[PDB]
Predict the structure of Myosin-7.
Amino acid sequence: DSEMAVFGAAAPYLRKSEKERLEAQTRPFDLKKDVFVPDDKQEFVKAKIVSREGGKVTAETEYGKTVTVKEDQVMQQNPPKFDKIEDMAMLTFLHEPAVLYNLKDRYGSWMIYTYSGLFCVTVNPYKWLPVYTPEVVAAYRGKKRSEAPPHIFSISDNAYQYMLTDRENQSILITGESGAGKTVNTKRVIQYFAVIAAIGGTLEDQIIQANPALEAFGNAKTVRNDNSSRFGKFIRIHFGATGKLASADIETYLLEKSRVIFQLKAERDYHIFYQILSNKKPELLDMLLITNNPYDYAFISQGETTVASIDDAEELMATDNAFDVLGFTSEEKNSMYKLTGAIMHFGNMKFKLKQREEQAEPDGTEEADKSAYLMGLNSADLLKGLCHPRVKVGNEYVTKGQNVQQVIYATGALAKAVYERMFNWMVTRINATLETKQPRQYFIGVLDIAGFEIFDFNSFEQLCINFTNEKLQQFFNHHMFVLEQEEYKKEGIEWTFIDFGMDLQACIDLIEKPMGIMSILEEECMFPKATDMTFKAKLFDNHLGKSANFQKPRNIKGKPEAHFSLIHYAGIVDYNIIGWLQKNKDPLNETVVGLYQKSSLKLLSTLFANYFQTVSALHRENLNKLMTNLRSTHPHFVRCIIPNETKSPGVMDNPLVMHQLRCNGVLEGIRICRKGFPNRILYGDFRQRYRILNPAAIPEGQFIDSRKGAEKLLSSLDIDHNQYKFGHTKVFFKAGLLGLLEEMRDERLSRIITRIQAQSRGVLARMEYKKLLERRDSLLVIQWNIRAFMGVKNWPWMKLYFKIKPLLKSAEREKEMASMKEEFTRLKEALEKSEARRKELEEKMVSLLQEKNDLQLQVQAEQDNLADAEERCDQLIKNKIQLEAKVKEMNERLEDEEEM
Amino acid sequence: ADAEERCDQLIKNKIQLEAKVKEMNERLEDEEEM
Ligand SMILES: Nc1ncnc2c1ncn2[C@@H]1O[C@H](COP(=O)(O)OP(=O)(O)O)[C@@H](O)[C@H]1O
Ligand SMILES: CC(C)n1c(=O)cc(N[C@@H](C)c2ccccc2)[nH]c1=O
Ligand SMILES: [Mg+2]
C-alpha cells in the first residue's frame, strides 16, 4: 500500500505485497485438496491429495514424490489469504508445518520475523538484512502488534506501551540456541530504546557499546559460532515518569574464565588476545612486548587462531572505541591490556625440577621478569612466591615447595583469576558510568543469558551457560503457561486449565537444588583431599536413576575417561569432568595474590583488594537474584532460531528450525494465545479509559459501579458476547474482542481527540510562531542597535557618550534597583523551594532508613542461620569423610581376616 | 531454604551412614569372635 513506503527498502523483507496477496489468490488452491505431508530431509513439504483410502491418505508432493500418509500426519494448508501471515495466531488450521512454511516462505523472502501469538519467533539470516535500519525503528513507534508487521521492534514498542499504561516494570527475554542472534537482537532492542530517546545521547550510546566492549573480552569464535559470547548478561533499562530513557544496569553472571588458558582445535581464545596480537597499532604490540605471531604463546595459541570472517584489526579498533565511549580511562584500558598480555606471558615461564629436592626453579627467567614487569611485581619475589608459596600455620607462615606441574597449574589459576576479576571490574565500571543520575520509576529488563551449545568438548562454563539459559526457558514455561493460566482461575472465569506439558523444572532442580550438580561441585571443592575421579563417582551416584534428565553417556566417539551428558532444553550436551574442582574453588597462591595486592599497578591492587562462596555458588545466587528481579516485571519473550549449521545465509534447514520451535514451545504459545485471553485491564482503569465508547452508558457526575457499568457498556457494544468474560477486578477479552475494543477506542478517541489535537496544534503553532515573532522583534532591535552602535562610534561625539553615562546617576540607581529586585525575587523562590524539598525529603529519608534497618536486622537473622548451617554441614561432611575412610579400612580388614 | 535442606539431607545421609557403620562394626566384632 501507500503506507508501507515508510518501511523503505526493507518493505519487501517485512510484508508480503498486496500484489503478492492477489497473486496468491490467483494460485490454484483448494482447502479440500491442499495439505502438508512429512518427510525426512525436509520436516514437512507441500502436497496435494490424490485419493482418500478410508483411514489412509495418498498425496503427491511439489517435488513429485508420492507417499501414503495417515490423517494425524496430514493437516490442512491454510488458504492463500492466510499463507505467510504476519501473526501465526491468525492461522485457520493450527499445526507445526503451518508454522514451518509461514517461516520458510517469509525467510525464503528474507522476512525473518513472525509472531506466535503474543510474542516473536526469529529464524536467523546470516545475511545482514535491512530489517534493522534505524529508520525502520521509527516505523514501529506506537505501531501496535495488530497493525505492525512482525519484528523485534514491535516487542520493544509493546514493552514501552505496557510500561506507560500499567505503570509496572517490563522485560524482553531474548532466547534461543547459540548463533541465532541473541546478542545482535539485544543490540537491536537497545538500539530501539536508544534511537527512540534519540529523537526525543550519553546513556543512549553507552548502552549500545556496553555490548561489544564486554563481547571482545567475553566472546570467542567457537565451532558453533564465530562470535559466541561466553558470559550471561542481564540488563535493566530504566525509564523516568515522562517515558524518556533514564538509566541502565548491567549484571553479568559468569565469565568462561577457563578459556583464557585453553582452547580446543577449531576455537580461539578470547578475541581480545588475537586482536591485540594481530595489530595495526605496534605500540600495543610492544608495550606488552609480545610477538606479533600468535603461535609462540602456548596458552592462547593452541586450538585455532585465524578465522574466516573477522577483521581482528577492526575488532581491536571496535573494542578500543567501545572503551572510549564507555569512558574507561587510558590508564585503565592499558592496564587491562597489560593484564591480558601478562596472562599470555605467564604460560611462557619455564620451570625445572631440582636434581634432588623436587622443587621448581626458573630456567626461563626472561619470561618471568617479562610477566612481573607487566603485573608490577618483582621477578625474584614472584618466582619465590610461585615456587615457594606461603601458607599460615598458627600465627607464623610456613613455606612449601611446589612441583613443576603444580606451579604450572598455579600459574594457570593466577591467569584465570586475574582475567575473570578484570572482567567483573570492567562490568562494575560500566555500571559506574551508564548513570545520568535521574529519578527512576520503571525499567525494562532485556536478557541474553546464553546460547545453548554443543561442542565436541564441553567444560565447567559449558555447564554454566547451558544451565543459565535453561532457567530462562523454564521462565518462559512458567510465565506463559502457569502465571497466565492461574490468573484466569483466580479471577473466577469459566475457563478450563489445559496442561501443555512443557516443564523442565526437574532439570533446573537437577542443577540448582542442594543435591544438584553445581551443589555437588561446591560441597566437594572445600575438601583439600577431593579429586575429580571421586567427584565423578559421587556425581554419578546422586543423579543416575534419580533424575529424568540425567543418563549414562554412550561415548560412541570414544573418549570414555571421565564423561557425563546432560540433556539441556535444546538437546544433548556432553561434558568432560577433568579439572572442574580446581576451576570451582579457584585457589590462588596467597603469597602471590598478597604480592598482587601489593602491586605498583593500581588496577591490580584494586582487583585484589579485599581478596562457602564458590564460583558455582556466586553464579547461582546471581541467577536466583535474576529470576526474583524478573518476576517483578511484565515479560515478552523472543525466540531466536538458528536455521542451519553451515552459516549458509538464506538457506533454511527444516529439521534444525522445527526442532528449535519444539524445544522453545512456541506452538504451545500460539495455542494459549488463541485459546486464552491475551489482555485484561483493571475495571477502574478501563472504565475511565474507554467509557468514551458510549458516554451515555457511563454518565459523569452520576454514580456508576465499575463492574456493573462495564457489564452495561460491553452489552451495549453488541459484540459477540462469548468474546468477553468478567473477573473480580479485571475484565477479560479474547484476542478478537481485545483487538476490536482497542480499534474502537482508537477510532472514538481519534474522532474526539483529533479535534482536540487540532486545537493543540493550533496553540502549539500559534505560540511557537509568536515566539518566532518575538525573536524576530529582538533580532530587529538588535540590528537597529548595531546600526546605532556603528553610527555612534563613527560619530566623533562618542567620547562624551560612552565614558560619561557609566559615571552618571542611571548606572548608580537603575542598576541598583535591578539588583534589588533580582535578589529579592531569587530570595523568595530559593527559600520556598529549599524549605519544601527539605521538609518532604527528610521525612522520606528517615522512613526509608528505618525500613533499611529493619531489613538489615532480617539480613542479620539470615547470616546467623547460614553460619549455623555452615558449621553444621562442615562438621557433618568432615566426619563423613573420616568415618567413610574408617569403614573402607574396616571392610578390607574383615575381607583379609575371612581370607585367612 | 538451601541451608536447611542441606543440613536435613546431611542428617538423613548420616542416619543411613550410621546404619552402615553399625552393621560393619558388628560384623568386624563377629569376625573377631570367630
Ligand atoms: N538477524 C540477523 N541478521 C544478521 N546477522 C545475524 C542475525 N542473526 C545472527 N546473525 C549472525 O550470526 C552470528 C551470531 O549472532 P549473535 O547475535 O552473536 O548470536 P549468538 O550470541 O547466539 O552467537 C553473528 O555473526 C551474526 O552476525
Ligand atoms: C496481565 C497482563 C497479561 N496484561 C494485560 O492483560 C493487559 C495489559 N495492559 C492493558 C491495560 C493495555 C492494553 C493496550 C495498551 C496498553 C495497555 N497489561 C498486562 O500486563
Ligand atoms: Mg551471544
Notes: The radius of gyration of chain A is 34 Å.
